[PDB]
Design goal:
182 residues, seven-stranded antiparallel sheet, 13 strands, binds beta-L-fucopyranose, binds calcium ion, Antifreeze protein, sugar binding protein, fucose-MpPA14 complex, PA14 domain, carbohydrate-binding protein
Length: 182
């Protein structure tokens, strides 16, 4: 079965084709089995240089989560991650504020809540609010990629109208939606 841990299910995919947008990365995910799996328990990755998909840059980027890699991917020019699972959120209003190079998309309960559909050097976007109607574990997924060069990915979330933001980590993540005791 699907292991229960305090994190999202992570998949890494590399390619020697150019990633320009969300569609390109999603097509890469659809095209093959993941080059590596991991547990995404502390979703604040990077920053680094000289291509995420080369050498040990992925390990450096994933940091605290890299010890759960299923393998050490070989070199590629371009690469990214697909995260999916659950996040505990009380009913209320929230918004993401994301620092990234290159682009990304986060969905909650199937609906996009933070999107950058293009390549970019590091930039921080404060995204529009969204609502949670019922307290509990919410479905969440994320994609992020690097087309080359520098790389960073730090989604943060606010519950208090943008006064404070937190990283999504083992305090509130669940791989399956069951309560983790890990
Ligand atoms: C679009 C930008 O291109 C630059 O050359 C890269 O160094 C940045 O990391 C980013 O991907
Ligand atoms: Ca796949
Ligand atoms: Ca490697
Ligand atoms: Ca780190
Ligand atoms: Ca670790
Ligand atoms: Ca959708
Ligand atoms: Ca590229
Ligand atoms: Ca880049």
């Amino acid at each position: 079965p699907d292991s229960l841990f305090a994190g999202l299910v992570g998949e890494y995919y590399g390619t020697n084709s150019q990633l320009n947008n969300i569609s390109d990365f999603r097509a890469l995910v659809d095209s093959k089995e993941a080059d590596a799996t991991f547990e995404a328990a502390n979703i604040s990755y990077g920053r680094g240089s000289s291509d995420v998909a080369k050498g040990t840059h992925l390990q450096e980027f994933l940091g605290s989560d890299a010890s759960t890699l299923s393998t050490d991917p070989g070199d590629n020019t371009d690469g990214g991650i697909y995260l999916q699972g659950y996040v505990y959120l009380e009913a209320g209003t929230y918004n993401f504020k994301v620092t990234a190079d290159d682009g990304y998309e986060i969905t909650i309960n199937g609906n996009p809540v933070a999107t950058v559909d293009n390549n970019q050097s590091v930039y921080t976007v404060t995204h529009a609010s969204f609502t949670i109607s019922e307290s509990g574990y919410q479905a969440i997924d994320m994609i992020w990629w690097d087309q080359g060069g520098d790389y960073v990915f730090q989604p943060t979330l606010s519950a208090d109208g943008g006064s404070t933001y937190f990283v999504l980590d083992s305090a509130i993540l669940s791989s399956t939606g069951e309560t983790p005791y890990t």
